Design an enzyme around this catalytic site. Structure first.
Site, PDB file in Angstrom:
ATOM      1  CD  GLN B 147      19.213  40.316 -13.090  1.00  0.00           C
ATOM      2  OE1 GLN B 147      19.385  39.481 -12.193  1.00  0.00           O
ATOM      3  NE2 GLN B 147      19.312  39.993 -14.370  1.00  0.00           N
ATOM      4  CE1 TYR B 332      -7.881   3.817  13.902  1.00  0.00           C
ATOM      5  CE2 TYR B 332      -7.017   4.039  11.677  1.00  0.00           C
ATOM      6  CZ  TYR B 332      -7.344   3.244  12.764  1.00  0.00           C
ATOM      7  OH  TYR B 332      -7.162   1.884  12.715  1.00  0.00           O
ATOM      8  N   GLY B 444      -1.154  -2.705  15.831  1.00  0.00           N
ATOM      9  CA  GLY B 444       0.057  -2.048  16.312  1.00  0.00           C
ATOM     10  C   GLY B 444      -0.177  -0.730  16.992  1.00  0.00           C
TER      11      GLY B 444
HETATM   12  C1  F43 Z   1      -7.052  -4.599   5.841  1.00  0.00           C
HETATM   13  C2  F43 Z   1      -6.879  -3.966   7.233  1.00  0.00           C
HETATM   14  C3  F43 Z   1      -5.482  -4.396   7.695  1.00  0.00           C
HETATM   15  C4  F43 Z   1      -4.667  -3.146   7.501  1.00  0.00           C
HETATM   16  O1  F43 Z   1      -3.442  -3.151   7.448  1.00  0.00           O
HETATM   17  N1  F43 Z   1      -5.460  -2.087   7.370  1.00  0.00           N
HETATM   18  C5  F43 Z   1      -6.877  -2.416   7.296  1.00  0.00           C
HETATM   19  C6  F43 Z   1      -7.591  -1.726   6.123  1.00  0.00           C
HETATM   20  C7  F43 Z   1      -7.196  -0.252   6.040  1.00  0.00           C
HETATM   21  C8  F43 Z   1      -7.789   0.563   4.874  1.00  0.00           C
HETATM   22  C9  F43 Z   1      -9.243   0.171   4.482  1.00  0.00           C
HETATM   23  C10 F43 Z   1      -9.666   0.719   3.116  1.00  0.00           C
HETATM   24  C11 F43 Z   1     -10.609  -0.166   2.328  1.00  0.00           C
HETATM   25  O2  F43 Z   1     -11.559  -0.757   2.888  1.00  0.00           O
HETATM   26  O3  F43 Z   1     -10.397  -0.248   1.102  1.00  0.00           O
HETATM   27  C12 F43 Z   1      -7.557   2.007   5.384  1.00  0.00           C
HETATM   28  C13 F43 Z   1      -8.618   3.053   5.009  1.00  0.00           C
HETATM   29  C14 F43 Z   1      -6.163   2.539   4.965  1.00  0.00           C
HETATM   30  C15 F43 Z   1      -5.974   2.726   3.455  1.00  0.00           C
HETATM   31  N2  F43 Z   1      -5.365   1.810   2.848  1.00  0.00           N
HETATM   32  O4  F43 Z   1      -6.397   3.710   2.852  1.00  0.00           O
HETATM   33  C16 F43 Z   1      -7.646   1.751   6.894  1.00  0.00           C
HETATM   34  N3  F43 Z   1      -7.639   0.521   7.208  1.00  0.00           N
HETATM   35 NI1  F43 Z   1      -8.282  -0.198   9.054  1.00  0.00          NI
HETATM   36  N4  F43 Z   1      -9.227   1.567   9.452  1.00  0.00           N
HETATM   37  C17 F43 Z   1      -9.964   1.862  10.530  1.00  0.00           C
HETATM   38  C18 F43 Z   1     -10.150   1.116  11.650  1.00  0.00           C
HETATM   39  C19 F43 Z   1      -9.914  -0.224  11.664  1.00  0.00           C
HETATM   40  C20 F43 Z   1     -10.525  -1.170  12.690  1.00  0.00           C
HETATM   41  C21 F43 Z   1     -12.027  -1.398  12.441  1.00  0.00           C
HETATM   42  C22 F43 Z   1     -12.729  -2.013  13.661  1.00  0.00           C
HETATM   43  C23 F43 Z   1     -14.206  -2.249  13.447  1.00  0.00           C
HETATM   44  O5  F43 Z   1     -14.821  -2.872  14.338  1.00  0.00           O
HETATM   45  O6  F43 Z   1     -14.779  -1.818  12.413  1.00  0.00           O
HETATM   46  C24 F43 Z   1      -9.710  -2.445  12.517  1.00  0.00           C
HETATM   47  C25 F43 Z   1      -8.634  -2.576  13.608  1.00  0.00           C
HETATM   48  C26 F43 Z   1      -9.201  -3.013  14.950  1.00  0.00           C
HETATM   49  O7  F43 Z   1      -9.921  -4.030  15.006  1.00  0.00           O
HETATM   50  O8  F43 Z   1      -8.931  -2.329  15.961  1.00  0.00           O
HETATM   51  C27 F43 Z   1      -9.052  -2.187  11.192  1.00  0.00           C
HETATM   52  C28 F43 Z   1      -8.447  -3.174  10.526  1.00  0.00           C
HETATM   53  C29 F43 Z   1      -7.986  -3.138   9.131  1.00  0.00           C
HETATM   54  N5  F43 Z   1      -7.608  -2.084   8.527  1.00  0.00           N
HETATM   55  C30 F43 Z   1      -7.918  -4.387   8.289  1.00  0.00           C
HETATM   56  C31 F43 Z   1      -9.310  -4.703   7.695  1.00  0.00           C
HETATM   57  C32 F43 Z   1     -10.344  -5.167   8.726  1.00  0.00           C
HETATM   58  C33 F43 Z   1     -11.579  -5.694   8.040  1.00  0.00           C
HETATM   59  O9  F43 Z   1     -11.454  -6.751   7.392  1.00  0.00           O
HETATM   60  O10 F43 Z   1     -12.665  -5.076   8.155  1.00  0.00           O
HETATM   61  N6  F43 Z   1      -9.136  -0.913  10.791  1.00  0.00           N
HETATM   62  C34 F43 Z   1     -10.736   1.826  12.842  1.00  0.00           C
HETATM   63  O11 F43 Z   1     -10.751   1.353  13.980  1.00  0.00           O
HETATM   64  C35 F43 Z   1     -11.410   3.182  12.707  1.00  0.00           C
HETATM   65  C36 F43 Z   1     -10.726   4.002  11.618  1.00  0.00           C
HETATM   66  C37 F43 Z   1     -10.640   3.197  10.318  1.00  0.00           C
HETATM   67  C38 F43 Z   1      -9.792   3.845   9.232  1.00  0.00           C
HETATM   68  C39 F43 Z   1     -10.600   4.764   8.306  1.00  0.00           C
HETATM   69  C40 F43 Z   1     -10.814   6.169   8.845  1.00  0.00           C
HETATM   70  O12 F43 Z   1     -10.082   6.613   9.759  1.00  0.00           O
HETATM   71  O13 F43 Z   1     -11.739   6.854   8.350  1.00  0.00           O
HETATM   72  C41 F43 Z   1      -9.247   2.644   8.457  1.00  0.00           C
HETATM   73  C42 F43 Z   1      -7.812   2.808   7.967  1.00  0.00           C
HETATM   74  O1  LIG Z   2      25.355  38.331  -9.969  1.00  0.00           O
HETATM   75  S1  LIG Z   2      25.365  36.842  -9.817  1.00  0.00           S
HETATM   76  O2  LIG Z   2      26.261  36.294 -10.868  1.00  0.00           O
HETATM   77  O3  LIG Z   2      25.923  36.703  -8.425  1.00  0.00           O
HETATM   78  C1  LIG Z   2      23.755  36.066  -9.870  1.00  0.00           C
HETATM   79  C2  LIG Z   2      23.245  35.753 -11.262  1.00  0.00           C
HETATM   80  S2  LIG Z   2      21.483  35.440 -11.343  1.00  0.00           S
HETATM   81  O1  LIG Z   3      -5.728  -4.302  11.203  1.00  0.00           O
HETATM   82  S1  LIG Z   3      -4.606  -3.343  11.483  1.00  0.00           S
HETATM   83  O2  LIG Z   3      -4.500  -3.150  12.952  1.00  0.00           O
HETATM   84  O3  LIG Z   3      -3.378  -4.065  10.961  1.00  0.00           O
HETATM   85  C1  LIG Z   3      -4.773  -1.795  10.628  1.00  0.00           C
HETATM   86  C2  LIG Z   3      -5.764  -0.879  11.304  1.00  0.00           C
HETATM   87  S2  LIG Z   3      -6.119   0.495  10.239  1.00  0.00           S
END
Ligand code: F43
Ligand SMILES: O=S(=O)(O)CCS
Ligand SMILES: O=S(=O)(O)CCS
Ligand SMILES: C[C@@H](OP(=O)(O)O)[C@H](NC(=O)CCCCCCS)C(=O)O
Ligand SMILES: [K+]
Ligand SMILES: [Mg+2]
Lengths: 260, 549, 442, 549, 111
Positions: B147, B332, B444
């Site tokens: 065009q 993680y 979980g």
């Molecule tokens: C608030 C929660 C509940 C939830 O739903 N998620 C949390 C927190 C959340 C936040 C923490 C951010 C912050 O501090 O502002 C983030 C980074 C997710 C986000 N929102 O961006 C995260 N966890 Ni959690 N979370 C982690 C993990 C973990 C491990 C920590 C175990 C230890 O002994 O330190 C435990 C679970 C367990 O016991 O298995 C855990 C729990 C928890 N995790 C507990 C907080 C525990 C505490 O009070 O310290 N995380 C991990 O096991 C490693 C990876 C790590 C993630 C960050 C990354 O991957 O860099 C983070 C993944």
């Molecule tokens: O020629 S057509 O009308 O099919 C497309 C217009 S951009």
């Molecule tokens: O503490 S929780 O297992 O619910 C979240 C881990 S990042």
């Protein structure tokens, strides 16, 4: 009459796991932590203050007739409509006398109306506030289930279960809710489980010796009792795995007869 | 002789086997050069850009750095980087890895060439194809061809946009202009080139690499459409057709439905998303995106480079942002591609299998799966028990569970060459780990692992699938970290044991061998390190259309 | 009869109805009550006349937080409910004596609309009931009040919401127990997309009936999905009979024996009963003396474990009078059961797996919510094939008022409408009646 | 008198009414400074990055510039820009306009505050809310608040990320920290502030402005999830709760389902996409995003600024890229916001209506709709007839049809205050235009216009809807250019005639009044000019994590 | 093969996918039993019949087909009987003009 066996395994670790599950096994009392001191470390309320309610008492409420529902006796705190509060522990992988799934299975065998959560770094129990206080005092803190140096009460910033111990054999705590008292050789809580400073520090006694911890721990460790040495436990784990696999493939007798 | 010893000595000053240490001596966040850079940067942007509204504040919550904050060594490399440099938001290499995957679409050319010859009566020769290839390289980045009074996309914004061609017909390949060809015979070792050519036959394909800027402004669903529009425009121009006639509709149907191969399929319900989004990529396709199979003969190395890409894409970008967000899931994912930990466990498993069964020499049975997974799980957890610094490194149980189970799953695949036998081994590793340390992962973590054994070999409609055909939309796998990237590695191990050139889609394998790609898909761990150190040159920036800085 | 299995039918009070009933008499493929439940769930629509009146008056059309100024209408819809109802019936009715049925409830504020089943017979799916009811309502309101032609689109928006811009009834005032097909998480999942709170509100919080309603719909969905086909059919039939319909009084017997018990004592009662009924057998004793057990009947052991799971929830959630405990109860009942015996748990680990994700997504930042908002279609709780949702319904019936997202908050409209249908309010009684009706015909 | 005369004088050398001109003497593309820049950019920076693979080539297809290539004047401004500077790819202001819309989500706070007080027994006060607001402004851009050893997002990459609060409760508003408040009483004129407060009641809301970089790496579906994660984290920290307990799940359900308001809903089937994508935005919501209503009392100006945003978003970004791609639809959209053409026709219609009926003083009837639409259509087409330079400017029939029908639709709304009466007028304008010049738009332009009259006032399930509740997923409207943006303007005209503070969602109207936004939603045509001239400072660039220029 | 699932299975179902899902399951079991297929190979049988399901919510690359598209492909509520390809109507009626018109009008007007 069925005689429960609780847990498989031929090592002392498997026996310690069986003892925890067994409601007839009396746990050894090691200390006396007063009710008032424990309520303060929990940090939900001050002792003597009336329990906060989530709903009115069950007697007041006029609920429709339900035969099966009313067959079950509610716990004292449910009857009085008390709110649901928690207690959370981090258990050191270095021979702590209680461990996450060990706790949850023990709670579900021994206690009524329990909500429990198991994680690698923390183990939580949510219950009616009043009932939670009696259990925490007589089972979770006064018995051999608790070691003041290798088990820490913490509601947030739980990091520590997988870390190296300090000079005095205490588990890491980023908030330092507890400290080692050099003079007495006792562990003292200076903060509540959520990190608020306490007006009065709470003494939780002296740490258990390494020889006692190795004898009563529920964790397998190469430097303790390796899981590799518990052939009986490995047999049952593999059996559960195979039974799950075959049932998922085809849940019929002929498949289990040929491949289990 | 443990592969992780070098990383532990670089990360920890004390004996790696010592159980006792000292804490609360590091000055909190002030110990880290990256955290200090963040505080300084915050002060500048709050005054200059935010009009005094505060943002980053290390004093609001957790006082970070009560323990020593550790750096990370990219596995198989000598690069040591700070943890924050591995977050997808702070790493341009991870972002470009995703941009290059997202902006790729493959279109079969044989249908279009048949419409030209049989419906329009226009001859197709290598000379016409070469003329077409020059046209699409002007049209695809946003240049006009038909065009009058058309506006165009600034070339400086779309330099990364290419249209390439590949063919299973060696006679045609010899006649095509090498500037536009993805040369199968030059890029792949002889045996791999023959497996790919036999799989694709005598068919010819176009690879559209849509500009990185397009996917950034818009989404994955835009990519196949952008490619189709410009393919249509290029055919009209190169073959002098009526600019909009009945036969043109056939080209659109072929480029959008009948002869199109994207990286991912559209997602339904709560995960509602267009095609070419991370959740739509099956594990077999993720294997084929990775190119280590082309440059290395090591089956373990081939599988672990797939784990690295899988963890970076599925855990950091997909689950950590698309499906959640915030601070996210950097560590993680890093546990699967740093400090040579998973490498040590996978190499141990490979040697155990090689000696006892041999590689790809055993039909899968429950006895074989149970033997291998048990041995590799016990070895892995014994390493965490023997080295307190290793346990302090993989501090989260989820990280430990994913690493031990990935090595177990990969090892089962090395013996059997069956991806479902491998995933069954992963599930046994998980329930065994739980009984070993009386813990597993987060709250979980094990939903899919408890469902695992029963659904691994299932034949039921929403439970069944070879691991290659499973992905982030497989029901049990839709929600949680520490699984998806490792499953991709298990899938690769089945094909690496067999010495396969590809796992599921040979068109994808050929498309991602293109030397014109920005990210190096043959060396992902090395590329990640380059991004971490701010040495990676990414596409998609808008310098030319912004005020001078 | 494809199977020789027999069951004893027991009511919600634990009283024997009949011994030696063929298992297939409770099958969704044979039971006349289950057939009627599917027919009625597909054709019944809940209409909120008070809602339509409020939306029109305020101009609050199109969804949450939306308000369109200058597009309000002040119409006394509730006051004219009888006239509207009669016009809707005239539009929907095919023959003078067909099953078209309309009922005004709560003084004309809400309407129970039962579209004639013939309209569903000549339809591919179930959206027809909602679409036909919406059209009949629009026409009835426009005719009753002589609404101006430039205002007709406003009537549409107050009834169906932001449709067709959104492929759902977003901000509408019509509702079904079934979610729109656009929200299905898998093929053949429509009967699984029913909120836990909807089952609870429809059965007036009666525990055994809420369990029965959820088990009937979940196990019927297993047939639609192709899960209850061929070699897998018997597993789902025994699951329905024992977990959902109190067969052999197994659920009530386990609850009675553990009135002051724990999840652990329920596990011990299950193993004892399975051994008594020859469903499981001893395999071998290991070094410590621990004895591994094996099923004598794979599908029947699965059903016994499933009935024990419901009993464990009743005992533990009943002791706390709090629904939050359910996720933990489902997880650890199955975990304890497996390590007590070496037998596979409920649904071969899938009930335990569902409970893991359910615990996490009912105690974290990432998603989910309270127990009452989950469904068999939900990304978090779809994994168990009909064995996890019925126990969740039991927990919500035991809850004394600890939940924010309770059935009173989420399911007031559907609850009031669907409780007017006998088979929905008391499913256990009517499914038992249906089994006795067809028992000698199969 | 004619508003477009100034632009025609600037664009064409000969008298605007002249019949003849000269062609083929401009030297093709060489006549344009922008085309010369593109050729030069292709040779330098582009070539060195492509390894000899050609790209931009003005000699392959159509020799552009056989006629004089014209610049464009942004309506109501004195900015004259080249056409290429208006393409969304080459204009950072258009990209930021979309980024700011995409990254917005609104969350009700009253439910969360009830969970705290009634379920947890924790008191909520203005002091606790102020503490919460400081926390979320650290957490939302990617700062850590609970866990030890967390990595974080570089603050320089997320300076545009804010969490703001607004309330209909004046007593609470007085007690909240002004740094975080979107002050309804200060930002809106008194009468508008009262209409908004009465509509929203005594409710409190938080506005999450997720970082621009997030939506660029990922998609629209990420936004509500990113906001929900960090809201949860901020509540745990500010109120000292158990970091993961039963009550936390209520906050997630409220922030993701029960109390969330996004800009757009998810799309199904062929258009499969997540929430906060352009196709999910209804016309009434698009009106409320635009902020000219707070700074101008001119109802015509208010409607035409909505047309500008609508054409830029729906035609250039959505239909031109998300749904197609390539060179795209810049000029299909510019016809509605350049050279004061639509302005002249809409102001003529306004004056005709003001004198004959008055503003918002007539109940809609077919006679009223037919009178207004006919008059405005005849005037509009008579302008194209009288001025050959105007016809050469809007060279495409689709551009002419959209402009004449938009002025007709807007004028019907000025008289009636009913959006469906306005859209009915648009459809009459279309079929009348077809009979006037014996042509309308492109091949498939009038699918929705032929369906138009019958579906405008329909009450049937997939045909009915007030224009406010219609959008790009309304069946007839799902495919074609030159309609969607104009429909948004027609929707605005109904509310401008009534002096309404908002069209459909008062929460959206308040959220887009925030002074912390990057794009100025009150002056979109001016912002577009600034982007065209490369004077607009956009967010989302990655300078700090890339090698030094 | 022409497979006509008993109408009773559709009577106790919410929609029509049951026919495809039940036929797929009966075929998988029939093939596995006829040839004594190893348990580690069952997932391969599934993939050859239904395709990349459940990763894709459709029968992608499958070998079973219906005149009706999957409900995941409906462009509106109540549209299932409209999702029938023009070529399917033509091929089913053996290209007889008046019958192809009648088949299409019957299905469209019933929709
Ligand atoms: C608030 C929660 C509940 C939830 O739903 N998620 C949390 C927190 C959340 C936040 C923490 C951010 C912050 O501090 O502002 C983030 C980074 C997710 C986000 N929102 O961006 C995260 N966890 Ni959690 N979370 C982690 C993990 C973990 C491990 C920590 C175990 C230890 O002994 O330190 C435990 C679970 C367990 O016991 O298995 C855990 C729990 C928890 N995790 C507990 C907080 C525990 C505490 O009070 O310290 N995380 C991990 O096991 C490693 C990876 C790590 C993630 C960050 C990354 O991957 O860099 C983070 C993944
Ligand atoms: O020629 S057509 O009308 O099919 C497309 C217009 S951009
Ligand atoms: O503490 S929780 O297992 O619910 C979240 C881990 S990042
Ligand atoms: C469960 C579901 O959330 P909802 O219950 O629908 O709110 C779903 N989220 C997720 O699965 C989050 C996955 C990523 C974070 C957890 C990694 S373990 C989603 O948003 O669609
Ligand atoms: K994007
Ligand atoms: Mg015994």
């Amino acid at each position: 009459a069925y005689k429960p066996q609780f847990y498989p395994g031929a090592t002392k670790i498997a026996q310690n796991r069986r003892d925890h599950l067994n409601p007839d096994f009396e746990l050894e009392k090691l200390r006396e932590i007063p009710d008032e001191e424990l309520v303060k470390v929990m940090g939900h309320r001050q002792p003597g203050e009336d329990y906060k309610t989530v709903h009115p008492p069950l007697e007041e409420m006029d609920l429709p007739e339900d035969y099966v529902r009313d067959l079950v006796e509610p716990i004292s705190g449910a009857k009085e409509g008390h709110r649901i509060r928690y207690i959370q522990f981090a258990d050191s992988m270095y021979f702590a006398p209680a461990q996450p799934y060990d706790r949850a299975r023990m709670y579900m065998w021994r206690f009524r109306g329990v909500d429990t959560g198991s994680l690698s770094g923390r183990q939580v129990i949510e219950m009616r506030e009043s009932n939670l206080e009696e259990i925490s005092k007589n089972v979770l803190m006064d018995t051999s289930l608790f070691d003041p140096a290798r088990i820490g009460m913490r509601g947030a910033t739980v990091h520590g279960h997988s870390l190296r111990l300090d000079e005095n054999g205490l588990m890491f705590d980023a908030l330092q809710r507890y400290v080692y008292d050099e003079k007495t050789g006792h562990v003292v809580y200076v903060k509540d489980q959520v990190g608020r400073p306490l007006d009065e520090p709470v003494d939780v006694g002296e740490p258990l010796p390494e020889e006692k911890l190795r004898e009563i721990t529920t964790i397998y460790r190469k430097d303790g009792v390796p899981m590799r040495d518990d052939e009986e436990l490995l047999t049952v784990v593999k059996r559960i795995h195979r039974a799950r696999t075959l049932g998922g493939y085809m849940p019929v007798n002929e498949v289990f007869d040929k491949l289990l | 002789k443990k592969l992780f010893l070098k990383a532990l000595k670089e990360k920890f000053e004390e004996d790696p086997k010592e159980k006792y240490t000292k804490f609360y001596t590091f000055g909190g966040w002030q110990q880290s050069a990256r955290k200090r850079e963040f505080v300084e940067a915050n002060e500048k942007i709050v005054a200059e850009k935010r009009g005094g509204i505060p943002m980053y504040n290390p004093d609001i919550g957790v006082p970070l750095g009560q323990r020593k904050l550790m750096p990370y060594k990219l596995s198989g490399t000598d690069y040591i980087v700070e943890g924050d440099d591995l977050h997808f938001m702070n790493n341009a290499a991870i972002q470009q890895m995703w941009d290059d995957i997202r902006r790729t679409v493959i279109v079969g050319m044989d249908t279009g060439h048949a419409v030209l010859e049989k419906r329009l009566g226009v001859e197709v020769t290598p000379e016409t194809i070469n003329e077409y290839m020059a046209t699409i390289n002007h049209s695809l980045p946003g240049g006009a061809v038909v065009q009058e009074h058309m506006v165009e996309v600034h070339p400086s914004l779309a330099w990364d946009c290419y249209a390439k061609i590949f063919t299973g017909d060696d006679e045609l390949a010899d006649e095509l202009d090498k500037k536009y060809l993805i040369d199968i015979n030059k890029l792949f070792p002889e045996e791999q080139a023959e497996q790919l050519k036999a799989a694709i036959g005598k068919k010819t394909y176009q690879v559209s690499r849509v500009p990185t800027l397009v996917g950034r402004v818009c989404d994955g669903g835009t990519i196949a459409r952008w490619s189709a529009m410009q393919i249509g425009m290029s055919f009209i121009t190169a073959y002098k057709l009526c600019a909009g006639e009945a036969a043109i509709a056939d080209f659109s149907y072929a480029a959008k439905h009948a002869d199109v191969v994207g990286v991912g399929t559209a997602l339904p319900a709560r995960r509602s998303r267009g095609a070419n989004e991370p959740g739509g990529i099956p594990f077999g396709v993720l294997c084929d995106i990775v190119q280590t199979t082309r440059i290395s003969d090591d089956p373990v190395e081939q599988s672990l480079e797939v784990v690295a890409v899988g963890a970076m894409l599925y855990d950091q970008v997909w689950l950590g942002s698309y499906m959640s967000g915030g601070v996210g899931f950097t560590q993680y994912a890093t546990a699967a591609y740093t400090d040579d930990i998973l490498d040590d466990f996978a190499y141990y498993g490979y040697e155990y299998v090689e000696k006892k069964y041999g590689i790809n020499s055993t039909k899968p049975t429950m006895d074989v799966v149970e033997d291998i997974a048990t041995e590799v799980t016990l070895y892995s957890l014994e390493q965490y028990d023997e080295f307190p610094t290793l346990l302090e490194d993989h501090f989260g149980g989820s990280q430990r569970a994913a690493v031990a189970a990935a090595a177990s799953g990969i090892s089962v695949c090395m013996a059997t060459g069956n991806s479902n036998a491998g995933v069954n081994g992963w599930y046994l590793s998980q329930i065994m780990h739980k009984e070993y340390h009386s813990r597993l992962g987060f709250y979980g973590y094990d939903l899919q692992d408890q469902c695992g054994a029963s659904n691994s070999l299932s034949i039921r409609n929403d439970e069944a699938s070879p691991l290659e055909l499973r992905g982030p939309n497989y029901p049990n796998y839709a929600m949680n970290v520490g699984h998806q990237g490792e499953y991709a590695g298990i899938t690769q191990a089945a094909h690496s044991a067999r010495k396969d050139a590809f796992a599921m889609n040979p068109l994808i394998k050929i498309a991602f061998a293109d030397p014109s790609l920005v990210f190096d898909f043959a060396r992902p761990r090395k590329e990640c390190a380059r991004g971490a150190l701010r040495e990676f040159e990414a596409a998609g920036e808008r310098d030319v259309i912004l005020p001078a800085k | 009869v494809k199977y020789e299995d027999k069951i004893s039918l027991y009511d919600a009070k634990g009283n024997l109805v009949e011994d030696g009933v063929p298992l297939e008499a409770i099958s969704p493929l044979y039971n006349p009550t289950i057939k009627a439940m599917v027919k009625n769930i597909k054709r019944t629509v809940a209409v909120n006349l008070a809602g339509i009146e409020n939306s029109l008056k305020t101009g609050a059309i199109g969804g949450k937080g939306c308000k369109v100024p200058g597009r309000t209408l002040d119409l006394p819809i509730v006051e004219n409910a009888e006239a509207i109802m009669d016009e809707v019936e005239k539009i929907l009715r095919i023959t003078p004596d067909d099953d078209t049925q309309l009922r005004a409830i709560n003084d004309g504020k809400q309407l129970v609309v039962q579209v004639p089943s013939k309209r569903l017979e000549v339809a591919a799916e179930y959206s027809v009931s909602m679409l036909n009811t919406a059209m009949a309502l629009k026409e009835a309101i426009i005719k009753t009040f002589d609404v101006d032609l430039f205002d007709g689109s406003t009537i549409h928006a107050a009834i169906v919401g932001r449709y067709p811009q959104v492929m759902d009834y977003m901000g509408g005032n019509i509702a079904s127990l079934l979610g729109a097909p656009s929200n299905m998480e898998g093929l053949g999942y429509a009967l699984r997309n029913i909120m836990v709170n909807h089952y609870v509100a429809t059965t007036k919080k009666n525990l055994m009936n809420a369990v029965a309603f959820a088990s009937i719909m979940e196990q019927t969905a297993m047939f639609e999905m192709g899960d209850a086909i061929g070699s897998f059919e018997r597993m789902h039939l025994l699951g329905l009979a024992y977990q959902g319909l109190n067969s052999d009084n197994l659920v009530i017997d386990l609850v009675k024996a553990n009135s002051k018990g724990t999840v652990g004592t329920v596990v011990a009662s299950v193993v004892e009963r399975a051994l008594e009924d020859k469903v499981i057998v001893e395999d071998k004793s290991l070094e410590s003396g621990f004895t591994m057990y094996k099923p004598a009947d794979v599908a029947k052991w699965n059903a016994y474990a499933a009935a024990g799971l419901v009993a464990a929830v009743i005992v533990n959630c009943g002791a706390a009078r709090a629904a939050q405990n359910v996720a933990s109860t489902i997880l650890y009942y199955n975990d304890i059961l497996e390590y007590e015996t070496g037998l596979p748990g409920t649904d071969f680990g899938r009930a335990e797996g569902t409970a893991v994700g359910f615990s996490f997504f009912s105690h974290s930042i990432y998603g989910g919510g309270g127990p009452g908002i989950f469904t068999g279609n939900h990304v978090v709780t779809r994994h168990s094939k009909g064995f996890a949702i019925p126990p969740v319904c039991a927990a919500m019936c035991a809850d004394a008022g600890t939940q924010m997202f309770s059935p009173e908050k989420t399911s007031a409209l559907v609850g009031a409408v669907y409780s007017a249908i006998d088979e929905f309010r008391e499913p256990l009684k009517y499914v038992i009646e249906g089994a006795l009706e067809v028992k000698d015909k199969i």
